[PDB]
# Entry
Amino acid sequence: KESAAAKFERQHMDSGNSPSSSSNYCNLMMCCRKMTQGKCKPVNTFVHESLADVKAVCSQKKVTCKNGQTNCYQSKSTMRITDCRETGSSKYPNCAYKTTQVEKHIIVACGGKPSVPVHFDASV
Amino acid sequence: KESAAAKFERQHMDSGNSPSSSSNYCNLMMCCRKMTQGKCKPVNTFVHESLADVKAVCSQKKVTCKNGQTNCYQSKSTMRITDCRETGSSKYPNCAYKTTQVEKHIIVACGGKPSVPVHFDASV
# Structure
């Protein structure tokens, strides 16, 4: 079972000076979104645009994915994204990320019917 | 199973939330700490002091828990904590919370051998 002491630690402890800092965004989001279980996903992009705008990318510029697959598309316009990358100090299960906010074109793989994004390939 | 489409949203979508927002702490933390599974925990407090400083509360002022038990202790100094409370708009699985930074004495319940904090009782 989860011991009572360990439960208390999970439910109530967050030791630090600036826990509510924006630079903590990735740590909490990478955790909330389940990408730190078993291992630390090294890199991940969050997109801050409407889902209608991201879904629209599936009918814009065609391009080859990084893995050779041919179902990739590049957004016509730049989008507000947050880039999360493990720090040189991150070691599972103590995953740590640096948060970076930039505006870049996103490249995603679309699949399914209707055709929707099913993989974030890269940003340019 | 989880659809590839849903997976994309969970992993790369964050509309309606800005990284540079201090007000978002609770929503991200309540989710990261797994207290939004099954139902939204109505209230939860996070402590920002050291684990050592919090464990030391078990040797401070003895008081009665809100539920009548007698293993509760109150900190001598005020501590830096974050108050998380479900908004009136909150609706599982879309749990919403208000983040309120405060500085009050905390009352925790102690148990085990050695006696460490095992339940957050209240702040005062």
